Design a binder for this molecule. Sequence first.
Ligand SMILES: *C(=C)C1=C(C)C(=O)N/C1=C\c1[nH]c(/C=C2\N=C(C[C@H]3NC(=O)C(C=C)=C3C)C(C)=C2CCC(=O)O)c(CCC(=O)O)c1C
Ligand SMILES: *C(=C)C1=C(C)C(=O)N/C1=C\c1[nH]c(/C=C2\N=C(C[C@H]3NC(=O)C(C=C)=C3C)C(C)=C2CCC(=O)O)c(CCC(=O)O)c1C
Ligand SMILES: *C(=C)C1=C(C)[C@@H](Cc2[nH]c(/C=C3N=C(/C=C4\NC(=O)[C@H](C)[C@H]4[C@@H](*)C)C(C)=C\3CCC(=O)O)c(CCC(=O)O)c2C)NC1=O
Ligand SMILES: *C(=C)C1=C(C)[C@@H](Cc2[nH]c(/C=C3N=C(/C=C4\NC(=O)[C@H](C)[C@H]4[C@@H](*)C)C(C)=C\3CCC(=O)O)c(CCC(=O)O)c2C)NC1=O
Ligand SMILES: *[C@@H](C)[C@H]1/C(=C/C2=NC(=C\c3[nH]c(C[C@H]4NC(=O)C(C=C)=C4C)c(C)c3CCC(=O)O)/C(CCC(=O)O)=C2C)NC(=O)[C@@H]1C
Ligand SMILES: *[C@@H](C)[C@H]1/C(=C/C2=NC(=C\c3[nH]c(C[C@H]4NC(=O)C(C=C)=C4C)c(C)c3CCC(=O)O)/C(CCC(=O)O)=C2C)NC(=O)[C@@H]1C
Ligand SMILES: *[C@H](C)[C@H]1/C(=C/C2=NC(=C\c3[nH]c(C[C@H]4NC(=O)C(C=C)=C4C)c(C)c3CCC(=O)O)/C(CCC(=O)O)=C2C)NC(=O)[C@@H]1C
Ligand SMILES: *[C@H](C)[C@H]1/C(=C/C2=NC(=C\c3[nH]c(C[C@H]4NC(=O)C(C=C)=C4C)c(C)c3CCC(=O)O)/C(CCC(=O)O)=C2C)NC(=O)[C@@H]1C
Ligand SMILES: [Cl-]
Ligand SMILES: [Mg+2]
Ligand SMILES: [Mg+2]
Lengths: 76, 169, 177, 67
Amino acid sequence: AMDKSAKAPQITIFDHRGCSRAPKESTGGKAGGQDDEMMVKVASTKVTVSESDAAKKLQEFITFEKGIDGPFTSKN
Amino acid sequence: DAFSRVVAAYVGGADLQALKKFISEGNKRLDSVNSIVSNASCIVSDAVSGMICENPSLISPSGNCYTNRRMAACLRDGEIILRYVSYALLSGDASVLEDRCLNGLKETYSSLGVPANSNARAVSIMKACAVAFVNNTASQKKLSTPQGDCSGLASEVGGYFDKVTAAIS
Amino acid sequence: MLDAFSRVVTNADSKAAYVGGADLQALKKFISEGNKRLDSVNSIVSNASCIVSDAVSGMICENPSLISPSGNCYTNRRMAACLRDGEIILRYVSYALLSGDASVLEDRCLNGLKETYSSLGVPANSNARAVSIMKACAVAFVNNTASQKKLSTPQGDCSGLASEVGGYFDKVTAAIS
Amino acid sequence: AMDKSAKAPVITIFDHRGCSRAPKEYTGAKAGGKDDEMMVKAQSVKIEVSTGTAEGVLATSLAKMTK
Ligand SMILES: *C(=C)C1=C(C)C(=O)N/C1=C\c1[nH]c(/C=C2\N=C(C[C@H]3NC(=O)C(C=C)=C3C)C(C)=C2CCC(=O)O)c(CCC(=O)O)c1C
Ligand SMILES: *C(=C)C1=C(C)C(=O)N/C1=C\c1[nH]c(/C=C2\N=C(C[C@H]3NC(=O)C(C=C)=C3C)C(C)=C2CCC(=O)O)c(CCC(=O)O)c1C
Ligand SMILES: *C(=C)C1=C(C)[C@@H](Cc2[nH]c(/C=C3N=C(/C=C4\NC(=O)[C@H](C)[C@H]4[C@@H](*)C)C(C)=C\3CCC(=O)O)c(CCC(=O)O)c2C)NC1=O
Ligand SMILES: *C(=C)C1=C(C)[C@@H](Cc2[nH]c(/C=C3N=C(/C=C4\NC(=O)[C@H](C)[C@H]4[C@@H](*)C)C(C)=C\3CCC(=O)O)c(CCC(=O)O)c2C)NC1=O
Ligand SMILES: *[C@@H](C)[C@H]1/C(=C/C2=NC(=C\c3[nH]c(C[C@H]4NC(=O)C(C=C)=C4C)c(C)c3CCC(=O)O)/C(CCC(=O)O)=C2C)NC(=O)[C@@H]1C
Ligand SMILES: *[C@@H](C)[C@H]1/C(=C/C2=NC(=C\c3[nH]c(C[C@H]4NC(=O)C(C=C)=C4C)c(C)c3CCC(=O)O)/C(CCC(=O)O)=C2C)NC(=O)[C@@H]1C
Ligand SMILES: *[C@H](C)[C@H]1/C(=C/C2=NC(=C\c3[nH]c(C[C@H]4NC(=O)C(C=C)=C4C)c(C)c3CCC(=O)O)/C(CCC(=O)O)=C2C)NC(=O)[C@@H]1C
Ligand SMILES: *[C@H](C)[C@H]1/C(=C/C2=NC(=C\c3[nH]c(C[C@H]4NC(=O)C(C=C)=C4C)c(C)c3CCC(=O)O)/C(CCC(=O)O)=C2C)NC(=O)[C@@H]1C
Ligand SMILES: [Cl-]
Ligand SMILES: [Mg+2]
Ligand SMILES: [Mg+2]
């Protein structure tokens, strides 16, 4: 059941082949190849949006502009 | 099993090699997931903005996004929904999406008065976003992905959005 | 000068100023290209969060050391300050585009800015790349050559205003580089 | 001079031609046409960025960078 906690999977995909920051977070050893420089991280974290951040977004939204992608579908 | 326990898990090296043996099209699948997750802020913003510009009464004093408190909850919910869809695509399965995000969600939204036609439109704009990111045809593109066909993965993520739509409409 | 915004631009108070109706009619003949100019400002400021976030994330993917433990965007505090500065600069550029004059941008944003960044160790090469990405975003929103269906405005040629806003970003680049 | 206040001019362009919500904030003279349904607002505002936003940009940057 949807448990009302506002927690959801937080994914980070690190394709860091060639990255000079050495990997130190894996736990299952080495593949002996480029999987050793890549990682998928999954956490369960509460999603939160502050009221001040929502006020910033409303000031953008209220003028009925858009990004590059998509059709313009506003009638205002 | 590791991601199941979580839903942090840090899957790299041999564990990542193993992970890509148990999900279909593992390398393409992780490209597809990253194309959505790394662009999630613009996806949620564009979907809520587009919901509102098609129906500006949502931010009038009688609308369900009125007040910063309600707008914040709506932006949050868009991100929660996109996260569960993204995780469905990462796992290749809808079971956590159904159990932890969708089961009970319509009943909650009905009690709250969160407008289902508006919600369906936010979800539909997120779906269009995610399809274009998977196929790398959004206006912001990844530069150096090996060329090939990810229409199967784009169809699969479309199906996860459709489960959301069906549950809440 | 836009007289209604005189107290806005000197930070003399926090009161909103409003230009509508006959005051707006007169504003659009005081500035040039009035309707297109206001459309251009609208398309930039309504996308401000994404322009700034894309510019800072792009600065960082080109130079990942910025969020290494020794980098100037490391920690939420430093990242927030950098995003904040990106928005401050974008907004002063948007005011130059609104008024058709760089004076407030030069006087209230750029004058003394490089010396502040020098004192703090805010890396000018990286700052210049954040500004150049924001510039590229603004030019694409203003001179958007997609079909009418994808535009929020009646189709026409806004390359002039795109060049103008480009020159205001170039004043930022020259001041801080 | 740059006064270190972190304030900037926040501009909001309200072109609300055809809008059923009546204009009220602007109390100056009327134009007698579509300019009475449109307004430029400007305000000196301290620009603030949240920890959540900073965390989101950090996550985007890590996911998009490669080497
Ligand atoms: C290369 C890109 C980078 C340059 C150049 C640079 O200066 N920093 C670079 C990368 C970078 N990585 C992190 C942090 C994390 N990276 C991982 C993923 C890797 N860990 C592994 O074990 C493997 C594979 C086996 C990886 C691939 C993770 C888990 C972290 C920790 C952060 C997190 O989000 O969990 C940073 C952040 C600063 C730091 O920790 O060094 C940077 C900038
Ligand atoms: C039409 C679009 C709308 C429909 C349909 C609807 O339900 N609400 C719509 C619009 C709407 N406007 C506001 C708020 C403000 N509008 C202005 C600008 C107008 N005021 C004027 O005096 C003139 C011209 C002379 C305008 C054009 C202003 C300044 C505001 C106040 C808020 C601001 O951000 O400063 C809203 C918000 C809710 C409300 O106040 O009604 C909406 C949804
Ligand atoms: C790291 C891998 C990395 C990035 C992150 C990315 C950064 C980057 N972005 C551009 C250019 C643009 N970004 C735009 C932004 C937006 N468009 C929208 O529709 C939304 C609302 C908003 C936020 C995403 C725009 C309009 C542009 C300009 C068009 C174009 O794509 O170029 C650049 C190019 C900058 C340049 O031209 O100098 C870069 C570097 N790129 C990455 O590499
Ligand atoms: C209100 C005036 C208004 C909107 C806001 C806008 C809403 C809208 N957006 C789409 C489609 C897409 N949006 C995308 C988003 C992004 N692309 C990027 O490059 C950045 C990072 C990000 C944020 C802006 C994308 C990828 C799409 C799909 C594009 C394509 O298919 O190639 C639509 C269409 C939704 C539909 O098809 O059902 C709409 C309406 N339009 C407005 O009028
Ligand atoms: C649709 C998604 C894209 C498309 C994707 C393709 N990606 C291909 C290969 C490939 N991708 C990665 C990165 C991936 N694997 C990882 O483990 C992680 C991170 C943890 C990620 C982000 C790898 C390693 C590879 C293999 C090739 C390589 O060495 O780089 C791919 C080629 C086919 C295949 O491998 O199945 C394709 C088609 N390509 C497209 O054109 C659409 C837009
Ligand atoms: C580049 C900027 C755009 C582009 C812009 C065009 N806008 C045109 C006309 C137009 N725009 C407005 C709205 C404007 N006037 C205001 O007073 C306010 C807010 C206070 C705004 C946001 C009006 C009222 C008009 C004129 C009436 C109308 O045509 O609707 C326009 C056509 C006229 C001209 O060419 O001068 C253009 C070309 N067009 C584009 O393609 C790029 C993306
Ligand atoms: C945005 C596109 C919507 C919109 C959304 C609103 N949602 C509000 C509250 C709310 N949402 C949830 C579901 C959420 N919590 C979870 O734990 C998960 C999944 C694991 C999800 C998807 C809950 C349980 C609640 C109520 C409790 C809470 O606020 O945290 C809401 C606030 C309503 C109210 O307070 O008046 C809004 C505004 N509103 C819209 O108009 C569009 C369609
Ligand atoms: C982002 C693209 C940069 C970056 C930015 C940093 N800026 C930091 C501090 C700082 N910035 C300003 C200028 C700002 N305040 C103003 O009032 C105005 C204009 C009117 C502007 C443009 C000042 C005065 C300060 C110091 C005081 C303050 O932070 O309030 C900063 C350090 C923050 C901290 O450690 O707390 C950073 C990180 N850093 C980057 O790496 C890129 C290039
Ligand atoms: Cl774009
Ligand atoms: Mg408009
Ligand atoms: Mg001067």
